[PDB]
């Protein structure tokens, strides 16, 4: 059950990282357009229940990705985000509380990639 939860986090993390790579190889001036789209971060992210703040931000995430023409990505935005949605559902087993600051898409991915890495460490 803790070995199971840890593996789901391992997969969730794969997805986040996969997206973040697509985005750091957006060698298109259009990147400015993308980074202007603002994402909401969680006030605190210390427990699985806090993945709520990731669930609620997935629609805006999928949208922003769709703007970047497909040629640029190895994955399909709607797919990689459905995927992430599924994991988050199985991992939170509450109401979300947001930080006052917004962040670019890249900072947002980082915050969560980190969060995943933390939990995974403490579960080892």
From Swiss-Prot:
One of its GO terms (molecular function) is interleukin-2 receptor binding. GO terms for cellular component: extracellular region; extracellular space. GO terms for biological process: activated T cell proliferation; adaptive immune response; cell adhesion; cell surface receptor signaling pathway via STAT; cell-cell signaling; extrinsic apoptotic signaling pathway in absence of ligand; immune response; interleukin-2-mediated signaling pathway. Its main location: secreted. Keywords: Adaptive immunity, Chromosomal rearrangement, Cytokine, Disulfide bond, Glycoprotein, Growth factor, Immunity, Pharmaceutical, Proto-oncogene, Secreted, Signal. Disulfide bonds join 53-96. Transmembrane segments: none annotated. It is found in: Secreted. It is linked to A chromosomal aberration involving IL2 is found in a form of T-cell acute lymphoblastic leukemia (T-ALL). Translocation t(4;16)(q26;p13) with involves TNFRSF17. Cytokine produced by activated CD4-positive helper T-cells and to a lesser extend activated CD8-positive T-cells and natural killer (NK) cells that plays pivotal roles in the immune response and tolerance. Binds to a receptor complex composed of either the high-affinity trimeric IL-2R (IL2RA/CD25, IL2RB/CD122 and IL2RG/CD132) or the low-affinity dimeric IL-2R (IL2RB and IL2RG). Interaction with the receptor leads to oligomerization and conformation changes in the IL-2R subunits resulting in downstream signaling starting with phosphorylation of JAK1 and JAK3. Belongs to the IL-2 family. This is Interleukin-2. The lineage of its organism: Eukaryota, Metazoa, Chordata, Craniata, Vertebrata. The gene is IL2.
